[PDB]
Structure formats: C-alpha cells, structure tokens
Amino acid sequence: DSVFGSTTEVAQLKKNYFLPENIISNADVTRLINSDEIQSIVKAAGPSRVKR
Amino acid sequence: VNIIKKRTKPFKRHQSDRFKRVGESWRKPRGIDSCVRRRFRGTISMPKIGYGNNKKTRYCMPNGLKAFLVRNVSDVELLLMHNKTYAAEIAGNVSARKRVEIVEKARALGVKVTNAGAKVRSQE
C-alpha cells in the first residue's frame, strides 16, 4: 500500500502517484445486462437462432 | 452430411512440368501477357474461392471425421467427448513406446486412430 498507493491516496514510495482509474466500475458486464435494472425495461426478446 | 469435394486434383503451377527449377507449389502468374492467366481454353485452372469446400464438411477425412494430431496419452483423453467428430493422429516423431500407450488408451475411448499400425508389430 506504500509502494502503489490508492486510487484516491498517493503512493508513499512513488512521488505524486495514484493507482490508475478504470473505465468501468463493475467489470462483470453480464451482471449489468442481466440485472433487474435493465431487464425490467427491455422490450421482450425475439427468438434465439430463428427458424427458417 | 456426406463429405463432398468440389475438386480432387492439385492446382499445379504453370510450367512446373517444363522445368525442374520450377516447383509445383502454386504461384499466381504475375505476367501481363500470360495466356493461362487470361484463362484461354485448355489452359490449366487457377485457385478460385469457388472451389472452397462446404463449411460443414471442411477438414473432414473421407470417413467423416477430422484429424486431431496427438503427441501423448493426455491428448487422446481430450477427444473423449468428440470421438464421433474427430480422429486421433499420432505425430511422426512420437516413439514406439508412446505410440502403443496412445493406441491402447484411445481404443477404450472409442477413438479412431489414423496411423495405429505404425512402428509396431503383432505377436498375438
């Protein structure tokens, strides 16, 4: 924790260094897609692989 | 599905027969006056994408299976769930000690081996 610091607090053994910030917050995207937040407003899905 | 091949002949290089210095691997004819590149009559064919085989039966040996090169016993155990879909092939550099162990294991697994009679003898 002194070598690398935090994303908000600095490293002690590196000058002015903060751990990189991430583009996403929760990297589990299947958790985002299949959540009650998003699955409650999506339009009802058509078939998977469809018949001919 | 049956294993349909659109073509069975190799696409020999132009004038590979005329010269021993000219190999038989295909090279597109870069020439600008080349009659054969011009696809005259009787000129030998050139690799086109239309000869490409069916995506469902690509890579399939005449018996409907696909070759899966195998170097030891651990490899033949991967084909446990694909024995109707794949055939084991022992590499040429696998010794006759391992070849026997590969073949015996694969026999219980119900896996076809394309070269199971190699480097070995029978005693019965």
Partner: protein, 39 residues
C-alpha cells in the same frame, strides 16, 4: 430445503407476463386472420 433463487422468481414473473400477452394475442389473431381469409 433449498429455496428457489430470487432472480429465478423474478424471471418467472416476466416470462409469465410475456406468456399472458402472447396467449392473449392468439385467439384474436386466429379470428382476425380467419375473417381476413373469408374477406
């Protein structure tokens, strides 16, 4: 005594809700098509 997962209970409510309307637009669609065929 393993209770069914909560997310599974939520999906069933949506699947049931979707199945209600698909069944609802079955007898009407059959009738409307049938009358369309006579027309």
């Amino acid at each position: 005594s393993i209770f069914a997962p909560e997310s599974l209970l939520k999906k069933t409510k949506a699947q049931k809700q979707s199945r209600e309307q698909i069944v609802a637009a079955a007898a009407e669609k059959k009738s409307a098509r049938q009358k369309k065929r006579e027309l």
